[PDB]
Amino acid sequence: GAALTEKTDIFESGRNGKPNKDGIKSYRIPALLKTDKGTLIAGADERRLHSSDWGDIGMVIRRSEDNGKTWGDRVTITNLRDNPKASDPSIGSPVNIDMVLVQDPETKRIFSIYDMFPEGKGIFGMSSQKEEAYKKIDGKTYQILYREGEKGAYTIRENGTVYTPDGKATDYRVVVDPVKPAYSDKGDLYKGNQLLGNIYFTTNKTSPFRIAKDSYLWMSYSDDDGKTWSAPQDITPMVKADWMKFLGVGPGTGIVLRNGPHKGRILIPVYTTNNVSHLNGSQSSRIIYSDDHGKTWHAGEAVNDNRQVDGQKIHSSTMNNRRAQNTESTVVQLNNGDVKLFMRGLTGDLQVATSKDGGVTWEKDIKRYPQVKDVYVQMSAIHTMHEGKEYIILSNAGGPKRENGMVHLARVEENGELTWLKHNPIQKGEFAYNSLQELGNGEYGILYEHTEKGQNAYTLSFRKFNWDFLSKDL
């Protein structure tokens, strides 16, 4: 009957502030994906120097070919090299953080989309003034490079050749086609055959060039079930509006629409901040999507765009309202075609937005479910069918704080409305970010953050449970 496996540790953090067996202090931000081959891919932030949202962080995954019983060795998707001359190593490396995994059911290509920041304190080190990151030239978009003492924008063109602001080729070049393991050479700046530095370094530089100190979105893909990954592709220019300050993913696992006029569309949860209130009052959820199997991406509109708050309208680009913010989110499509966005917020309970057009726009009323508490932490939710009936399973912390992990079960009515049926505990003690996946045969899996015995935040563990666990009271 009711079944819940013992927790299995997939990514182990060190303890008492010390590095683990591999010299890594922390792991965070789980992403779990069940591929067409039945493989389970567990992704995470490999945070070597500390648990904060910056520093030396690699995008890594582990593959399980036996439904979660055993896992292979870590596979690094991307890990940029540190600035060896930074005065403070804790904030001395270009950063990659927070990933979203998803597989196209037709092409079978698996995508890993994550944030990228040049050297610094990441999202918590966002400059006050905007720096243009790209420049269009002859219908071609090129990434910009800045040089101290010059106002003009240099550009990185074909073969990584650096061009002067006046459009003339220089003897400088950027490694735009990295070849080292983990693509740690991406961004390396050369003058002839001499390695001078890296365009992602922002302090104590040894080369003359650096990219804009902004927020970026990178994408890597695998066509061999997660074993090998392509070099990172910068998709920022396709989805980041000029007013956006921060633009990052709502970590976890994205989806591909199963039905409706937009069937096949890949949806990736993301959120932004604006230059008016930034992290204090503008965090706003939305999704980015692709209708051509991940070749090109587009941004949907924010849930907060033209939203009525306390009698007046707001826009994600101009708002300054702490309570109206919605940040990291998880997305699900119902059988009626509607898209539901469950968003991390500050109301104390579950906030859900609904889109009738494949995730581009959102209906006016954001539904709140007092039945499901929200202590302001990431969550994950998935669509599922049982005995011909439609449901949604959602997991997050039960509180008081980021503790007591819960798995909430809701019945999906014909009109898309939700009816919460059960709320069952899955992990006592510390519990934070998590990622759910249906495994089939009435089983489900979850990769989540938890600590105990002095473990550093966090150790990512895995558990499997079935329908009896979800619907029955233990």
Curated annotation (Swiss-Prot):
Residues binding substrate are 28, 344
Q: Superkingdom of the source?
A: Bacteria
Membrane spanning stretches: none
Q: Where in the cell is it found?
A: Secreted, Cell wall
* Catalytic residues identified in the record: 53 (proton acceptor), 328
Disulphides? none
The residue spans of each BNR repeat are: 62-73, 220-231, 288-299, 353-364
**The family this protein is said to belong to:** Belongs to the glycosyl hydrolase 33 family.
Name this polypeptide is given: Sialidase A
User: Which species is listed as the source?
Assistant: Streptococcus pneumoniae (strain ATCC BAA-255 / R6)
Q: What is the lineage of its organism?
A: Bacteria, Bacillati, Bacillota, Bacilli, Lactobacillales
Parent sequence residues shown: 320 to 793 of 1035
